[PDB]
Short mmCIF file of C-alpha atoms and ligand atoms in Angstrom, two decimals:
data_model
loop_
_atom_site.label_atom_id
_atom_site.label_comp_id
_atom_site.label_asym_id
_atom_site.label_seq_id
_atom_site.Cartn_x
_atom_site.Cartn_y
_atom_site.Cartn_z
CA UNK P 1 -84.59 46.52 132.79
CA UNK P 2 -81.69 45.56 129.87
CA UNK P 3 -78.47 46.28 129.43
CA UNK P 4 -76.23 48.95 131.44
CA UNK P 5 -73.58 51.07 131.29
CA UNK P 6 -70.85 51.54 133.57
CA UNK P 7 -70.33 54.72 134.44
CA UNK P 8 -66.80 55.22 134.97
CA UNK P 9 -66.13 56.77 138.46
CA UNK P 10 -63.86 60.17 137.51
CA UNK P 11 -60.55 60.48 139.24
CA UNK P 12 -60.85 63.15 142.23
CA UNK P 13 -58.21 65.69 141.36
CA UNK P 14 -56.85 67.53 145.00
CA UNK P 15 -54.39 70.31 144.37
CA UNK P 16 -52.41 70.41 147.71
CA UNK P 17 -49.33 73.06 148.64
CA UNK P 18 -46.85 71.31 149.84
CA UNK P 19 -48.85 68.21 151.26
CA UNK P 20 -49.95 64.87 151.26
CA UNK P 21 -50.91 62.00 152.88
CA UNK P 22 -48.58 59.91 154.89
CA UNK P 23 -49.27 57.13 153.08
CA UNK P 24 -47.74 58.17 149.80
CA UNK P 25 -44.49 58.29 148.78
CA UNK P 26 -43.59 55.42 150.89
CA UNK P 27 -45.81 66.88 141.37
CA UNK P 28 -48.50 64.10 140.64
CA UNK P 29 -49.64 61.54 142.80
CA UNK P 30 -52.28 58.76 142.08
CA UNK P 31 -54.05 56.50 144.58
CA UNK P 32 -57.03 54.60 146.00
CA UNK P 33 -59.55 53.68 148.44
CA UNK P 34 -62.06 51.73 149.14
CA UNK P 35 -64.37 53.03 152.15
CA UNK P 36 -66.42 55.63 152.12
CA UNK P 37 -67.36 58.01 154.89
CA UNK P 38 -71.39 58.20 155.51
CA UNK P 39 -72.61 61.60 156.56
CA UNK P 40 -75.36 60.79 158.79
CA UNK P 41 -78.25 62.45 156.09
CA UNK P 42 -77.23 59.51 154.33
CA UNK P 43 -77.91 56.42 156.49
CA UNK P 44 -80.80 55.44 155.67
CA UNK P 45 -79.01 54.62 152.07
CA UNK P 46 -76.42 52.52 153.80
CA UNK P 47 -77.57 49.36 154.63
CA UNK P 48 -75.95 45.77 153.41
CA UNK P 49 -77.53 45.18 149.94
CA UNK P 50 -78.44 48.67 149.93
CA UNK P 51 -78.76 49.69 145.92
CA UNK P 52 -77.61 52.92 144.76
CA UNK P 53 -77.25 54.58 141.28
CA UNK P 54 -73.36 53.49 140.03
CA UNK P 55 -72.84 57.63 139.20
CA UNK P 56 -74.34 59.10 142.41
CA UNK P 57 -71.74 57.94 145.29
CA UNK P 58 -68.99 59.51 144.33
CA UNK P 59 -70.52 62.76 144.99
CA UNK P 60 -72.34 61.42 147.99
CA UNK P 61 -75.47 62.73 145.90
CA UNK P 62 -76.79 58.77 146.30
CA UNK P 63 -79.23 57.61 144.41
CA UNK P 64 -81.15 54.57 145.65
CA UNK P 65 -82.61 51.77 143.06
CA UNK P 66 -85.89 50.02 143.93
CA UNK P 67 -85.35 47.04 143.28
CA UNK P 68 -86.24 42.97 144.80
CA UNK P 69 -83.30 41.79 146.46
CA UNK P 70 -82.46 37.48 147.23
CA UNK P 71 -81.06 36.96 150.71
CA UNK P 72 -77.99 38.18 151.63
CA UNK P 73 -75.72 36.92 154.42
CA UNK P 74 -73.74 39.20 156.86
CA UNK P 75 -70.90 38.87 158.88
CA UNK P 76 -71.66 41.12 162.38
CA UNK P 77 -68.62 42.03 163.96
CA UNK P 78 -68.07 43.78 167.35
CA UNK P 79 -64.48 43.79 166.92
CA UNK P 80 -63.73 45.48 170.55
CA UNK P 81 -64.26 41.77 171.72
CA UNK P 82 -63.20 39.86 169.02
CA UNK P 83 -67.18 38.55 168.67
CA UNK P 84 -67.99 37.71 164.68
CA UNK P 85 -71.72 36.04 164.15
CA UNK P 86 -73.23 35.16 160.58
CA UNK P 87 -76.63 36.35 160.07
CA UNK P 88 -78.76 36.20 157.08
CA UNK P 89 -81.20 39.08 156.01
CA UNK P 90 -84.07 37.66 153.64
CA UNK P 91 -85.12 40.86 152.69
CA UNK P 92 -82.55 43.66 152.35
CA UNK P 93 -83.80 46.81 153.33
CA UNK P 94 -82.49 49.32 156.18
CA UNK P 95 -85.43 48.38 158.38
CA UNK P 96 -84.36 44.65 157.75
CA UNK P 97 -80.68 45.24 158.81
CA UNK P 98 -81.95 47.15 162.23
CA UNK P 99 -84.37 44.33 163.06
CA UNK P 100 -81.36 41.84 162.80
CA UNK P 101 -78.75 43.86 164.32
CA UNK P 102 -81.00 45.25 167.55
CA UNK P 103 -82.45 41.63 168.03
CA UNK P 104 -78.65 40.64 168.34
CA UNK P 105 -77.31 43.20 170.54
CA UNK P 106 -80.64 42.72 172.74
CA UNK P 107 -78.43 38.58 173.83
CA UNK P 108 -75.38 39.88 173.58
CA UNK P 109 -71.92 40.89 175.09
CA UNK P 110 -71.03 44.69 173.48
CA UNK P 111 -68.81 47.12 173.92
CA UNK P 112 -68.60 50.29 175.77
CA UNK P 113 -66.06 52.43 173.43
CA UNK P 114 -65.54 50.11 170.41
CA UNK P 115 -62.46 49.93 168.77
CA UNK P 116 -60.55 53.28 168.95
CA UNK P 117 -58.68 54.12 165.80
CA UNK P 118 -56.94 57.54 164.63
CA UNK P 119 -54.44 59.04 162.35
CA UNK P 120 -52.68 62.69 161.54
CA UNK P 121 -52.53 64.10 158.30
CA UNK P 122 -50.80 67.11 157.35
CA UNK P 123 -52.99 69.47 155.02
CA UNK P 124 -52.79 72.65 152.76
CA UNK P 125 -55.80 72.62 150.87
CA UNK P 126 -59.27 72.04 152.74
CA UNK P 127 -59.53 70.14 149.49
CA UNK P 128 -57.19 67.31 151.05
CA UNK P 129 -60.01 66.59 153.45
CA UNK P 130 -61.65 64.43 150.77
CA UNK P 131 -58.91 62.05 151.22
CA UNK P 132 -60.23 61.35 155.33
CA UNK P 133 -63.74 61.02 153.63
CA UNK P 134 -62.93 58.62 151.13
CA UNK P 135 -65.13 60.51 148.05
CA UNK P 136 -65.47 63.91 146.43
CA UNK P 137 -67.80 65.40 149.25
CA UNK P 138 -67.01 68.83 149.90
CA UNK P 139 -64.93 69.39 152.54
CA UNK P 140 -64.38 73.17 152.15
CA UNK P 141 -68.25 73.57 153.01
CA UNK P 142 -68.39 71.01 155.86
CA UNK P 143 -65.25 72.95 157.17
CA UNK P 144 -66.67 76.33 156.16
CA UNK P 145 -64.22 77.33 154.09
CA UNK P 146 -66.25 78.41 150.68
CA UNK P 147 -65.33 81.95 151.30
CA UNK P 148 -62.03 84.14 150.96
CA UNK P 149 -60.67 85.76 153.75
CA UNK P 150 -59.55 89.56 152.67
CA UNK P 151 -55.61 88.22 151.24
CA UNK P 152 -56.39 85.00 152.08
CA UNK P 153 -57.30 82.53 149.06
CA UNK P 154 -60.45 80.50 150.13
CA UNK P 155 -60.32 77.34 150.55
CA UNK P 156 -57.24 76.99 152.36
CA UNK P 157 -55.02 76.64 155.79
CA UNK P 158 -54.68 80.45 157.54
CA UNK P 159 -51.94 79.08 159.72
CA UNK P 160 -48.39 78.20 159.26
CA UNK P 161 -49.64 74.47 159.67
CA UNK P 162 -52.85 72.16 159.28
CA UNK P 163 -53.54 69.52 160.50
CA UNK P 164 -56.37 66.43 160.39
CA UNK P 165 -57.20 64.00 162.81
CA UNK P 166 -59.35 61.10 161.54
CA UNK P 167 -60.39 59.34 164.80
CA UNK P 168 -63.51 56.71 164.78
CA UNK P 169 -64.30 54.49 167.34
CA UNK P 170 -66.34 50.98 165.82
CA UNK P 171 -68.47 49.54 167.79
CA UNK P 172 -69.70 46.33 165.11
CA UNK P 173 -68.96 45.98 161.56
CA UNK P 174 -71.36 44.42 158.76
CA UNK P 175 -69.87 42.56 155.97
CA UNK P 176 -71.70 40.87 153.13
CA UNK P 177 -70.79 37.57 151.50
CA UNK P 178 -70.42 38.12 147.82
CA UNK P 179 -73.75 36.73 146.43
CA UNK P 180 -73.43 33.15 145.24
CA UNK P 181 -75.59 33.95 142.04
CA UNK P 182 -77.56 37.31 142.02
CA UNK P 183 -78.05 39.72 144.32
CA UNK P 184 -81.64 41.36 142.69
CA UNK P 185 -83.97 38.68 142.20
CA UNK P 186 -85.75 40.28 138.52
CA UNK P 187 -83.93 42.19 136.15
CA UNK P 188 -87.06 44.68 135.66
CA UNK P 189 -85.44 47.95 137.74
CA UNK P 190 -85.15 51.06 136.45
CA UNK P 191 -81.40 51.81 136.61
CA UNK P 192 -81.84 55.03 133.93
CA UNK P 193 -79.41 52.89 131.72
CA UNK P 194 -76.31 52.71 134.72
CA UNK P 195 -74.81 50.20 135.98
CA UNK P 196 -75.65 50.40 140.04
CA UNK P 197 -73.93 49.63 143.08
CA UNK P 198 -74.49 47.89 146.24
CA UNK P 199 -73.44 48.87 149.29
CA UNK P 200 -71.25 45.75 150.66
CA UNK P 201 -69.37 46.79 153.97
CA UNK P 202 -70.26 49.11 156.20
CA UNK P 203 -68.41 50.34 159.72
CA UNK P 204 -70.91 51.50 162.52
CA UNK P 205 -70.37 53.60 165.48
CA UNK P 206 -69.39 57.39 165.43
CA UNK P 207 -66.65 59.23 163.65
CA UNK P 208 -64.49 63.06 163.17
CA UNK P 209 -62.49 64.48 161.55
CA UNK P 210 -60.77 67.29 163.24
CA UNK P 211 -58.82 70.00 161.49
CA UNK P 212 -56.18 71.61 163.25
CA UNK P 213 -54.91 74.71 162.24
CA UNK P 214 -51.69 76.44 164.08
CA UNK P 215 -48.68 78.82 163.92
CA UNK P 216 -46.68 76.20 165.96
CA UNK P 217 -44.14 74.33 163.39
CA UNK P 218 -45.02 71.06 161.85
CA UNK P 219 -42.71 68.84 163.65
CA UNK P 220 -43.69 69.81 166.84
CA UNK P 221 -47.51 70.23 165.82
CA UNK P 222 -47.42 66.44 164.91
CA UNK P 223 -45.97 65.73 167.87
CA UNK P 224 -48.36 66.94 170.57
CA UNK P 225 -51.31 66.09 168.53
CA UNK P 226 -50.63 62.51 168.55
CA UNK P 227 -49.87 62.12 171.93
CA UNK P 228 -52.48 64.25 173.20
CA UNK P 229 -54.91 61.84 171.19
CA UNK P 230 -52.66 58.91 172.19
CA UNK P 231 -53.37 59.98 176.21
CA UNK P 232 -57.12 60.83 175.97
CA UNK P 233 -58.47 59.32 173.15
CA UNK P 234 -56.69 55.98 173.09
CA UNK P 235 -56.01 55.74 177.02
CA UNK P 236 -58.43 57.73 178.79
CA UNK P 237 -56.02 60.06 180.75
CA UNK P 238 -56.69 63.91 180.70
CA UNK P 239 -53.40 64.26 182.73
CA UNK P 240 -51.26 66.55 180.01
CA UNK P 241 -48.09 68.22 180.04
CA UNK P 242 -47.79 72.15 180.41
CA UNK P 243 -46.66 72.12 176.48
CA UNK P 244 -49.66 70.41 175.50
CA UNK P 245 -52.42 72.56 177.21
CA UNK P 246 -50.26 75.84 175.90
CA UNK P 247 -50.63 74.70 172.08
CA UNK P 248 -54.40 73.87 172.54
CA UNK P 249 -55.50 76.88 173.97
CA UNK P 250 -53.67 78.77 170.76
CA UNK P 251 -54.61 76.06 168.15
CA UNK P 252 -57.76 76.55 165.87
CA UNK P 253 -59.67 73.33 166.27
CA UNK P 254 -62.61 72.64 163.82
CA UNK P 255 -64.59 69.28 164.36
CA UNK P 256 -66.93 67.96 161.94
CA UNK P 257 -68.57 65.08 164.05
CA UNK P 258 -70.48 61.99 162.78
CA UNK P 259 -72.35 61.29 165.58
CA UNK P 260 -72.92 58.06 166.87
CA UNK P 261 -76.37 59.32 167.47
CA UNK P 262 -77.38 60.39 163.84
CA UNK P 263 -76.43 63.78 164.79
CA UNK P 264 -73.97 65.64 162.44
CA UNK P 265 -71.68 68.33 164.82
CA UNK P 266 -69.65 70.75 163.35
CA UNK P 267 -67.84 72.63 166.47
CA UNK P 268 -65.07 75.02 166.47
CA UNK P 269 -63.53 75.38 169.43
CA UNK P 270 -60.60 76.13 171.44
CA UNK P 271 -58.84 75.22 175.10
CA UNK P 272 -58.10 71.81 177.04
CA UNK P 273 -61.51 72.08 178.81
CA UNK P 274 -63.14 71.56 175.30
CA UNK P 275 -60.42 69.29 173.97
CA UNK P 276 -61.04 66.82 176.24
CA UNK P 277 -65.29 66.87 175.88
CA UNK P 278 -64.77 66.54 172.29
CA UNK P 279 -61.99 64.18 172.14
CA UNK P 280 -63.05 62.00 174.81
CA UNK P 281 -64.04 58.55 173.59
CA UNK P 282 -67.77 58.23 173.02
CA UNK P 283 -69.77 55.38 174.71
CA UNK P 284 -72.00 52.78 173.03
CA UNK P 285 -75.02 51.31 174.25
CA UNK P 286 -77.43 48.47 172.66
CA UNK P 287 -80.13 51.22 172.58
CA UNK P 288 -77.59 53.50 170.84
CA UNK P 289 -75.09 50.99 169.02
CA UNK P 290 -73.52 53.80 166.45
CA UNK P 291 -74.63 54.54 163.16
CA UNK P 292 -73.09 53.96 159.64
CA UNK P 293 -69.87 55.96 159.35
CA UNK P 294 -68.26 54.29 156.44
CA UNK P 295 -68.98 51.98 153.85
CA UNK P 296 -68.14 49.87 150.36
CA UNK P 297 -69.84 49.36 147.04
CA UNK P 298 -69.47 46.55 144.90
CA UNK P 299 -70.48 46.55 141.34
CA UNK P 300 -73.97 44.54 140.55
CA UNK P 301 -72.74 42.82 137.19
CA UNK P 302 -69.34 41.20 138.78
CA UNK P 303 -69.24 42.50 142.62
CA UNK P 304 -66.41 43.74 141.88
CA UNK P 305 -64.63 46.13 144.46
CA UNK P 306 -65.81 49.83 143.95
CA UNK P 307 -62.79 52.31 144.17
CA UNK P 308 -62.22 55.89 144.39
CA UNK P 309 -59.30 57.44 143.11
CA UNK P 310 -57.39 60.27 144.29
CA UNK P 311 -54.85 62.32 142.31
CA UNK P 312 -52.84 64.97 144.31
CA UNK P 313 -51.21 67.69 142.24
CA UNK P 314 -48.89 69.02 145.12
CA UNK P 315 -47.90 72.52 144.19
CA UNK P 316 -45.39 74.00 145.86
CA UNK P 317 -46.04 75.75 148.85
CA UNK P 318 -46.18 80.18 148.47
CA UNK P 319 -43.76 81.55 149.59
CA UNK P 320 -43.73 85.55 150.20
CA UNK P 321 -40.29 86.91 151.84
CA UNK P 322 -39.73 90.65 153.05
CA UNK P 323 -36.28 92.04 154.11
CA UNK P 324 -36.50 94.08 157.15
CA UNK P 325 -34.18 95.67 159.17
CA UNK P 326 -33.56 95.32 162.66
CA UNK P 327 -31.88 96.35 165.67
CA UNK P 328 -31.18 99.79 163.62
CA UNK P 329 -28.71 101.61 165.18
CA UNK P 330 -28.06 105.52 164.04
CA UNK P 331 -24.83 106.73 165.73
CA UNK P 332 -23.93 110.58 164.95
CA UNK P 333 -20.40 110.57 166.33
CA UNK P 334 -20.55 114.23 166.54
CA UNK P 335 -22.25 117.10 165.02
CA UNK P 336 -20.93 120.42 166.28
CA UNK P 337 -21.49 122.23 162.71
CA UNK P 338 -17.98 123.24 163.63
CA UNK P 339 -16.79 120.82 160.72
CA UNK P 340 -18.56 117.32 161.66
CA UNK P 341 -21.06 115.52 161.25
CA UNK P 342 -20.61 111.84 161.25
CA UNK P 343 -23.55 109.36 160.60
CA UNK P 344 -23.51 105.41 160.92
CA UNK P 345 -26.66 103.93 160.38
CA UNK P 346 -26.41 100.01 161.47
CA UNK P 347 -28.67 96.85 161.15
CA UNK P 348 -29.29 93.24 161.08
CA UNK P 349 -31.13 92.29 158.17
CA UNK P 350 -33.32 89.81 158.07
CA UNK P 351 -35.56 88.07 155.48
CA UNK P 352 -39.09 86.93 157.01
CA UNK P 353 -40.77 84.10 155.53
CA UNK P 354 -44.81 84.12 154.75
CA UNK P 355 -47.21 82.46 153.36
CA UNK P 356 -49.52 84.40 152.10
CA UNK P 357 -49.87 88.67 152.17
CA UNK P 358 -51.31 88.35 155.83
CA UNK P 359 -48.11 87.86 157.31
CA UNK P 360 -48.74 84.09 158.23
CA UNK P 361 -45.24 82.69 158.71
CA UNK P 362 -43.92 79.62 156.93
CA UNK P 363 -40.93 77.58 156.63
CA UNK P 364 -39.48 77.07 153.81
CA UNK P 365 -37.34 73.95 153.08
CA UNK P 366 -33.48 75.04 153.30
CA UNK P 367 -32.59 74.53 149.61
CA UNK P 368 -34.75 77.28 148.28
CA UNK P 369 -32.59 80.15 147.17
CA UNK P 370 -33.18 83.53 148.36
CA UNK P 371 -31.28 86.47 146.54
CA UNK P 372 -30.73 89.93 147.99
CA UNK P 373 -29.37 92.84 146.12
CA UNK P 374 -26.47 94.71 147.72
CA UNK P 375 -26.62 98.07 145.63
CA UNK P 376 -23.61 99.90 146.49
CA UNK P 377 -23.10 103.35 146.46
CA UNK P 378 -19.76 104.53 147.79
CA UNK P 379 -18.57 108.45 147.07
CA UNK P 380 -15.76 110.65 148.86
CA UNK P 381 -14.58 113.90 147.99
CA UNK P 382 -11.68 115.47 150.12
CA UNK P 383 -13.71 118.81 149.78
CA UNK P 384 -17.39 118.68 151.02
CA UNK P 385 -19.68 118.87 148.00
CA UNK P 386 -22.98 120.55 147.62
CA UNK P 387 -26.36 118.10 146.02
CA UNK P 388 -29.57 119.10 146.37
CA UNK P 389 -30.79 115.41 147.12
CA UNK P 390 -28.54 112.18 146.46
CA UNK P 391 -30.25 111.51 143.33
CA UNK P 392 -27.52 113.67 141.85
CA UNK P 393 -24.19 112.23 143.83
CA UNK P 394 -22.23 111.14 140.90
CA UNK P 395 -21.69 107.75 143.07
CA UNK P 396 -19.52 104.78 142.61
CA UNK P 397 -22.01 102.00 141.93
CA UNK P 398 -21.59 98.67 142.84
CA UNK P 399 -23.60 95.63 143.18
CA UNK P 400 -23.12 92.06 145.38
CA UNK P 401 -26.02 89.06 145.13
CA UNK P 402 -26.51 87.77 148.79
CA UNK P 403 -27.66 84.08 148.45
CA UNK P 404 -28.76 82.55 152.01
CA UNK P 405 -30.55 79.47 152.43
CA UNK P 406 -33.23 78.59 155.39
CA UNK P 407 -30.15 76.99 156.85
CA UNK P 408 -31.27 76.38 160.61
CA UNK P 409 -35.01 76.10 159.74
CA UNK P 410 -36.79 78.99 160.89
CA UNK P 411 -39.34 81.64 159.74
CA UNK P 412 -36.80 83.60 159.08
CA UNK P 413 -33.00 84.30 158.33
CA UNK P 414 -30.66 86.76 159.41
CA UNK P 415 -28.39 87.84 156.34
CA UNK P 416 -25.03 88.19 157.63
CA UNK P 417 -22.92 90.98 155.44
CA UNK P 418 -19.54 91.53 157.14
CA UNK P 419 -17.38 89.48 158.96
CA UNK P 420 -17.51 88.48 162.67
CA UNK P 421 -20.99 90.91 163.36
CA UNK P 422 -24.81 90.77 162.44
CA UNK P 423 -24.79 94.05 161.27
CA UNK P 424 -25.02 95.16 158.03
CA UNK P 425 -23.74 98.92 157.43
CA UNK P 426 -27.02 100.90 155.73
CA UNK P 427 -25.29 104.23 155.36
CA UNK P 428 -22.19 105.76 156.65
CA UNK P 429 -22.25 109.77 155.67
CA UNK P 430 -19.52 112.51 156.43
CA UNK P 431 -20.91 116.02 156.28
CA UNK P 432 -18.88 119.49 156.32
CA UNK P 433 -15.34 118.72 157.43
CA UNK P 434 -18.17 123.39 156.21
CA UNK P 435 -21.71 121.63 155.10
CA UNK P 436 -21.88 119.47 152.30
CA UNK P 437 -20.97 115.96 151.35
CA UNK P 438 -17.49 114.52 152.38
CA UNK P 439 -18.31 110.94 152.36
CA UNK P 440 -21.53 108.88 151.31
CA UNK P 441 -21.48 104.80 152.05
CA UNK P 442 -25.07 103.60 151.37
CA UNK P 443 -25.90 99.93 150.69
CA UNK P 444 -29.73 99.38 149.32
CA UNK P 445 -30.58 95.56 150.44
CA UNK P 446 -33.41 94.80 148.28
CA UNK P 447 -34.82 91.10 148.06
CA UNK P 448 -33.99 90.19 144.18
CA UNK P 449 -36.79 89.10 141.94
CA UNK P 450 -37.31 85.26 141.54
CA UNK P 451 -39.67 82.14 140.56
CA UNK P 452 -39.43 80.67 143.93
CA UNK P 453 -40.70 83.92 146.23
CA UNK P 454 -42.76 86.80 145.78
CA UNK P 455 -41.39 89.59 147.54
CA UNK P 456 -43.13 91.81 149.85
CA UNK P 457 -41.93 94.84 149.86
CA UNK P 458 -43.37 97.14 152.81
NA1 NA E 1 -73.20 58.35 158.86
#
């Protein structure tokens, strides 16, 4: 009705663990975008020209602004054919835009799948997802992850790995000239003092987002994702390898579906059989053309490009480590209580790497220290010796610092202590020779406290 503020759009602040977009870096990163996704309760707000309240998009908690639009003039695009056509809408509205588009698509040549488009994104934080959605939507409940898991912090990846496949298939695109002069005929609207926006592009047809959790490792996970997608989604074929159909019937799929319909799926779901009915490219028809499943804003003052910025904090990943003990061997040499008794107790330790107090593994970049106490305790006596426990052995004490490094990527690390063997000597203990102690060779391994691990000690 007079003059309006511009309510400044906040940056969306994502802590990740260990994770980001492919895009970046191409901790603290800042960046932007400027579509949208539409969840389909939404659609009837996204329409060219539509008019929405400039501090209620960001949340997706839109606002719509009654007010009289001029004419606007859209580009329709049904970009699977290369087919642009100009088409003005006197009278903005979203029953204006469906009058124009179906009375197009009644004439014309369409498309059967659209254009097919997806991309893999590595993920930590169900957080992240807000990146594939283009605004501060929640993605922990669409994913239904707004609870903790007993040890498990909510919000986040169970597996070793996540994973998120934005795939969306276009069937026609609607873009708005920028008005000539302006786009609301009368400046009488209620805006409750805020500057609005319009909505100014907008991609039809039907969109997901997949998350992909597994225990597989990254590099590999990345791998058969993308051409699994690359063989169904972009070229139709169902024929996979015996690699691929083993890491989809163990990987945790979770689709959250903007259907081309208006429906809204969310689907967990596991196995190839599934897989392929869920990854398997929709079809269009000019009865069912696809529905809004991202858009723009522009600013009413200057049309000016609304964007939405993202700033990841990537934290470092946890990491919890335990030192266990393998292969133990316990030799007693002999034992006749006729003067011997000779005990070797053997083992290959190994560090196992988590990340969190489930026992999820991880693996950690090789550069991250890990430190493990050798304690020592070494004690002979050419006599045997009588102690109630070994609390009391007046013993020799002696301590090395292990350091060992994730050297050959794994989830976990054996600790070599000697020369030329994986085993480690735990105790060696000489008895009688007669009952007592002759000889007493233990070494306590113990992981050694530090910034970069927690240590599990069971
Ligand atoms: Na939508």
């Amino acid at each position: 009705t007079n003059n309006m503020a511009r309510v400044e759009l906040p940056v969306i602040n994502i802590t990740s663990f260990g994770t980001k977009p492919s895009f970046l870096n191409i901790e603290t990163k800042e960046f932007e975008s400027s579509e949208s996704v539409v969840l389909n309760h939404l659609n009837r707000y996204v329409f060219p020209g539509s008019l929405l309240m400039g501090n209620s998009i960001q949340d997706l908690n839109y606002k719509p602004v009654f007010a009289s639009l001029n004419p606007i003039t859209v580009s329709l695009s049904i970009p699977a054919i290369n087919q642009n056509t100009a088409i003005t809408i006197t009278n903005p509205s979203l029953s204006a835009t469906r009058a124009a588009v179906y009375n197009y698509l009644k004439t014309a040549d369409f498309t059967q799948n659209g254009q097919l488009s997806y991309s893999i994104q590595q993920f930590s934080s169900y957080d992240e997802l807000k990146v594939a959605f283009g605004s501060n939507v929640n993605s922990r409940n669409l994913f239904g992850k707004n609870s903790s898991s007993t040890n498990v912090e909510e919000g986040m990846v169970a597996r070793q790995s996540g994973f998120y496949v934005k795939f969306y298939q276009t069937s026609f695109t609607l873009d708005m000239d920028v008005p000539n002069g302006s786009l609301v005929k009368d400046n009488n609207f209620d805006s409750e003092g805020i500057e609005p926006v319009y909505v100014s592009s907008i991609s039809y047809g039907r969109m997901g987002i997949l998350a992909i959790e597994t225990n597989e490792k990254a590099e590999d996970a990345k791998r058969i994702i993308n051409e699994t997608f690359n063989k169904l989604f972009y070229k139709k074929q169902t024929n996979f390898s015996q690699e691929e159909k083993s890491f989809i019937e163990g990987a945790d799929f979770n689709l959250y579906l903007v259907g081309g319909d208006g429906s809204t799926a969310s689907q967990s779901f596991k196995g190839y059989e599934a897989f392929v009915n869920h990854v398997s490219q929709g079809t269009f028809s000019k009865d069912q053309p696809g529905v809004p499943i991202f858009c723009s804003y522009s600013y009413l003052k200057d049309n000016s490009p609304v964007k939405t910025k993202f700033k990841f904090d990537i934290k470092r990943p946890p990491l919890y480590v335990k030192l266990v003990k393998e292969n133990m061997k316990d030799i007693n040499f002999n034992d006749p209580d006729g003067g011997i008794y000779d005990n070797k107790k053997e083992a290959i330790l190994k560090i196992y790497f988590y990340k969190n107090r489930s026992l999820v593994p991880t693996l950690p970049n090789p550069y991250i220290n890990f430190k493990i106490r050798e304690k020592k305790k070494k004690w002979q006596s050419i006599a045997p010796v009588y102690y109630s426990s070994l609390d009391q052995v007046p013993f020799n004490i002696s301590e090395r610092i292990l350091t060992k490094q994730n050297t050959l990527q794994n989830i976990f690390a054996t600790i070599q202590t000697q020369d030329n063997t994986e085993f480690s000597l735990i105790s060696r203990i000489i008895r009688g020779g007669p009952a007592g102690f002759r000889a007493i060779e233990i070494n306590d391994y113990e992981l050694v406290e530090d910034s970069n691990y927690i240590i599990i000690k069971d």
